[PDB]
Paper text:
Botulinum neurotoxins (BoNTs) comprise a family of seven serologically distinct neurotoxin types, designated [name] through [name]/G, that cause botulism, a rare but potentially fatal paralytic disease, in vertebrates. [name] molecules are synthesized as single polypeptide chains that are processed into mature toxins by cleavage into two subunits, a 50 kDa light chain (LC) and a 100 kDa heavy chain (HC), that remain connected through a disulfide bond. The HC consists of a 50 kDa N-terminal translocation domain (HN) and a C-terminal receptor-binding domain (HC) of similar size. [name], [name]/D, [name]/E and [name]/F bind synaptic vesicle protein 2 (SV2)16.
In order to understand how [name]/A2 can compensate for the missing interactions seen in the [name]/A1-HC-[name]-LD complex structure, we determined the crystal structure of [name]-LD bound to [name]/A2-HC. As in the previous [name]/A1-HC – [name]-LD structures, the quadrilateral β-helix structure formed by [name]-LD binds to a two-stranded, antiparallel β-sheet on the convex side of [name]/A2HC. In the extended β-sheet, the interaction is dominated by backbone-to-backbone interactions. [name] subtype A2 contains a Glu at position 1156 and a Ser at position 1294 and can neither form a cation-π interaction, nor contribute to an overall positive net charge of the receptor binding domain. The structure of the [name]/A2-HC complex provides an explanation why human [name]-LD can still bind strongly to toxin subtype A2 despite the pronounced sequence differences in key residues to the A1 subtype. Specific interactions compensate for the lacking cation-π stacking. [name]-LD His 564 NE2 forms a salt bridge with [name]/A2-HC Glu 1156 OE2 and a hydrogen bond with [name]/A2-HC Tyr 1122 OH. Furthermore, Glu 1156 of the toxin engages in an anion- π stacking interaction to Phe 563 of [name]-LD. In [name]/A2-HC, residue 1294 is a serine, which does not engage in polar contacts with the receptor. In the [name]/A2-HC – human [name]-LD structure, the polypeptide chain in this region forms a long extension that makes a crystal contact with a symmetry-related [name] molecule.
Author numbering:
A (entry chain A): 873 to 1166, 1169 to 1225, 1233 to 1295
B (entry chain B): 464 to 566
Amino acid sequence: IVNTSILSIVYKKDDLIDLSRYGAKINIGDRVYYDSIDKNQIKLINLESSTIEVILKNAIVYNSMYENFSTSFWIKIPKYFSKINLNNEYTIINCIENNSGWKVSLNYGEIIWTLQDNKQNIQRVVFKYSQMVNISDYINRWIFVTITNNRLTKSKIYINGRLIDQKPISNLGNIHASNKIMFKLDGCRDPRRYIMIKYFNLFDKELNEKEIKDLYDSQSNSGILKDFWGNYLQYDKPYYMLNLFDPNKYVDVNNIGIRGYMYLKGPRGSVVTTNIYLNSTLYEGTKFIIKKYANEDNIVRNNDRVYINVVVKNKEYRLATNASQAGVEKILSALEIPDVGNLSQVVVMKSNKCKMNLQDNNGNDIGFIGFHLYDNIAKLVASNWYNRQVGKASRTFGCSWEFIPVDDGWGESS
Amino acid sequence: DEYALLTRNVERDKYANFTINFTMENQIHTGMEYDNGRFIGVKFKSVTFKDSVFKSCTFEDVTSVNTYFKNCTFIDTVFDNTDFEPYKFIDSEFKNCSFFHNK
């Protein structure tokens, strides 16, 4: 359905381009940034040169009372750290001219869609998210926004395919939007503020729920493993580990060597700015580094074969086990890397719920990595029961992980 | 109008880039600023901080008894393995502070 697009912005050969049939002109400011690793990820900062201005052809400039339209984009919004971020709505995508049109704005814990007709009547729908939560689905993580407008019924906002808010807009006269869309932090009093955005689209219809989920799913890049923030999972990058069965725990190592084990330990600590945020600490426990064994670009893809290093006292060790342990659960150890010898250490990454499949060197499954409780110690294990359960589509517990790298949009000390 | 409020704007005594272990006792500290201060293995016995600022400090392996922070401000500060419950912080403010392993 990315075919209906009257405007589709993507990166290409050191440039932004509109792939639609109207080849809109795109003026890029002097302080606009892109992710060297996922070049479609664009960062805008709180300066007047961090601008992307799209000039629409007159054929598609919106000037109607009735025409339906939608837009969609991915956005990553850093946590709000200070009281200066309160009651300071700032525009980020502006298509308003002479006080009519549309815009996307942000505020503390909010995404806002605004429609304004040429009598200056207004309707807003808003997505609100809390910063007073242990682990947030939204803070500083890529989310999919979609807003649909049916001029005879309702304006609607979806987050990750899911309807959040809807408001009647039939009270609204003619809307004459600008012929420029300005991507820019506008009116934002926090100088360190930034946003990241990718795959902006406009459509001249009201997308239905099915088309919205289809966009959500295909733009997910389903064969590339993602870290916690939604970025591409990367080799040679340290990651704090989160186990989704119980995210209030982190990974620790009791001792190095084949006698030691890794395990899950809680509770997590806390990060706090009084009245602004209170979350769980994510930079806790022993970090994992993914190391190559198998498409040469440093991105981790579904079914790649990797080794996992574990970081203990800022020294790298190898995740490994001997499958000859009695029991299906094979406890995992952090080994000195030269001394690993013949022990099982090759891991098949997978993106859809169990993430790491340990194999021996003959290509045989030792099992997905999760945990087992021995005398109230949640030891990490490789276990083929997980693999058998995913076949039965049976319930698994503990084989689902998130990799959390350090990230400036989260802001926790080091 | 014409008659304005008389408020002292007095700069704080600044101490920075230090480590403290001594289990200091029976003290009052007012108008102090501690920047990049490390309090490692410290027993606060009957100590209180009034209108003081801590920036980029670490409290680690700390215990406290009859010890309070009144109208202090903590910024970029880590409390690791301490016994600091909220009631010990009266009219205080935290900005980007971390708590771990709170006993």
